[PDB]
């Protein structure tokens, strides 16, 4: 179903393709299996760490798709790993055994597909997490309009600052992960404008509060400047969301 992945997932899943191509051959192509107790112990250690980290994410996540789609993959990896462990124990008796062989093939296949499914499910939840932050900043930008005091401006700026920092970090990490260079350009340029307009917003709000209280002219020019900055910043954040949605959109709709 998914054609493109991030530069990270493509690199992690690059060797996996050839691994599966070899594992799928085994059923068609003497015996003597060399021990395999130590390499299987490493898989169990690796699998348990992945399932642990995975289960921590499912427990701490806000995402219902993740909470639903991730746990079946742990089971798929755990069942396949117990097959590798079961296989290693019957090879202790005699390395020349056909039932132990089938358990090794289905074990490795079941782990590889399971971890690739787990990774894709996780990255899909991550892009959703980035879209939620962006939308959150959008909503908080609409609040600038009610700020009419120095106390509220401090409150506002101290609430907006971390969100802007969280979003900027997310977008820098994300753009560096994309394979479409023109998509990266759209995200960097949009995030550049937001980063550049953020002190402009504060300056405009500061002029508005100082003119409001106190007193009179020019509240219209200050208002105009604040509203424009919010509108331009909002249009750019929406540009970021839309680029991220072009890529990530899944069924239905």
């Amino acid at each position: 179903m998914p054609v493109f992945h991030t530069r990270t997932i493509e690199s992690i899943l690059e060797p996996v393709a050839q691994q599966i191509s070899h594992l799928v051959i085994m059923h068609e192509e003497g015996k003597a299996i060399p021990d395999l107790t130590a390499p299987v112990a490493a898989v169990q250690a690796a699998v348990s760490n992945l399932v642990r980290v995975g289960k921590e994410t499912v427990q701490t996540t806000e995402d219902q798709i993740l909470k639903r789609d991730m746990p079946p993959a742990f089971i798929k990896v755990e069942n396949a790993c117990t097959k590798l462990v079961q296989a290693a124990q019957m090879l202790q008796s005699d390395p020349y055994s056909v039932p132990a062989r089938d358990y090794l093939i289905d074990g490795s296949r079941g782990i590889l597909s399971g971890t690739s499914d787990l990774l894709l499910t996780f990255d899909e939840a991550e892009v959703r997490k980035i879209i939620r932050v962006c939308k959150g900043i959008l909503e908080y930008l609409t609040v600038a309009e009610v700020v009419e005091t120095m106390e509220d401006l401090v409150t506002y700026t101290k609430n907006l600052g971390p969100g802007m920092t969280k979003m900027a970090k997310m977008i820098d990490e994300r753009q560096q992960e994309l394979t479409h260079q023109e998509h990266r350009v759209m995200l960097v340029n949009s995030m550049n404008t937001v980063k550049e307009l953020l002190p402009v917003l504060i300056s405009a709000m500061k002029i508005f509060v100082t003119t409001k209280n106190s007193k009179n002219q020019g509240i219209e020019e200050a208002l105009k400047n604040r509203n424009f900055t919010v509108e331009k910043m909002s249009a750019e954040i929406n540009e970021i969301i839309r680029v991220l949605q072009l890529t990530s959109w899944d069924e239905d709709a």
């Binding site: 691994q19 299996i33 299987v40 690796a46 760490n49 995975g54 990896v77 090794l104 093939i105």
Partner: peptide, 23 residues
């Protein structure tokens, strides 16, 4: 990158089990 690194170590641990089947 904890899940990504944990997944990477799993794929790496399965590699010696493959070459053992392939002889």
């Amino acid at each position: 990158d904890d899940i990504y690194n944990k997944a990477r170590e799993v794929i790496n641990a399965v590699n010696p089990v493959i070459e053992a089947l392939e002889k």
